């Protein structure tokens with residue numbers, strides 16, 4: 001809709017990179033507004049998918065989903081550039097290690113991620129990359145899902161998408177890892193991992209790749225994924241974060257049920273987290 005003229009785009013700084021793209025901060029100044037611009041870094045499989053990605057964000061209208069500004073005829077790398085709002089405090093992965101946030105605020109953030117996710121699922125889309133690095137902080141009381149690079153439509157007569165080296169396998173349910181099927185419930189498993197990350201304040205030594213690789217080992221050839229799948233199937237899970245309530249840990253564990261149908265939906269999670277937030281808010 002809003003065609004941002006490439007001439008008025010002044011690069012301020014790099015914001016971050018993810019799978020097949022890079023996001024950068026720009027001032028859109030036709031004389032002398034801060035916007036976030038995503039550009040393709042990349043194979044021809046992901047280049048045809050890029051247009052599909054832009055159309056996904058273009059049709060999402062939600063308070064806990066990053067605001068799509070427009071596009072620009074990007075000659076700079078031939079494929080189109082995606083213009084979004086600049087979400088001023090950044091990703092939770094970058095923010096939480098330096099800012100000690102209370103349990104109450106963390107649970108609000110979790111509730112808001114569920115609202116954005118329940119909305120995404122009602123639009124017949126799966127995210128496939130739900131992690132703290134993809135959750136942006138607008139202010140201390142507002143969070144938004146900020147990136148949709150792996151987001152796909154679930155085909156109409158199926159309950160899953162049939163799904164690479166860039167897969168976030170440490171955020172993935174066993175069905176994605178073993179059967180390469182991504183269900184709406186596979187996104188709930190990743191949410192449980194995002195909630196663990198939030199509760200550990202995104203501390204590196206406590207991260208899911210760190211924790212799972214201490215359980216797998218690093219000398220496993222091409223078998224890290226297989227070893228991950230079998231430990232998950234044996235019932236092993238990420239530990240309870242220090243100072244994470246026992247009830248919140250069980251909620252997380254319910255998000256990590258091996259059987260996808262035993263997991264809560266995002267719609268089921270919203271009233272539960274609302275109540276848990278209200279309890280720790282006082």
Ligand SMILES: Cn1cc(-c2cn3nccc3c(-c3cnn([C@]4(CC#N)C[C@@H](C#N)C4)c3)n2)cn1
Nearest residue numbers: 015016017018021023036086087090134146147
């Ligand atoms: C003070 N401060 C603000 C920021 C800030 C603001 N905004 N606004 C829109 C986007 C961003 C990002 C940002 C970083 N990484 N990403 C990605 C993952 C996601 N969401 C998107 C990219 C790909 N591909 C990685 C976005 N970072 C950082 N520090």
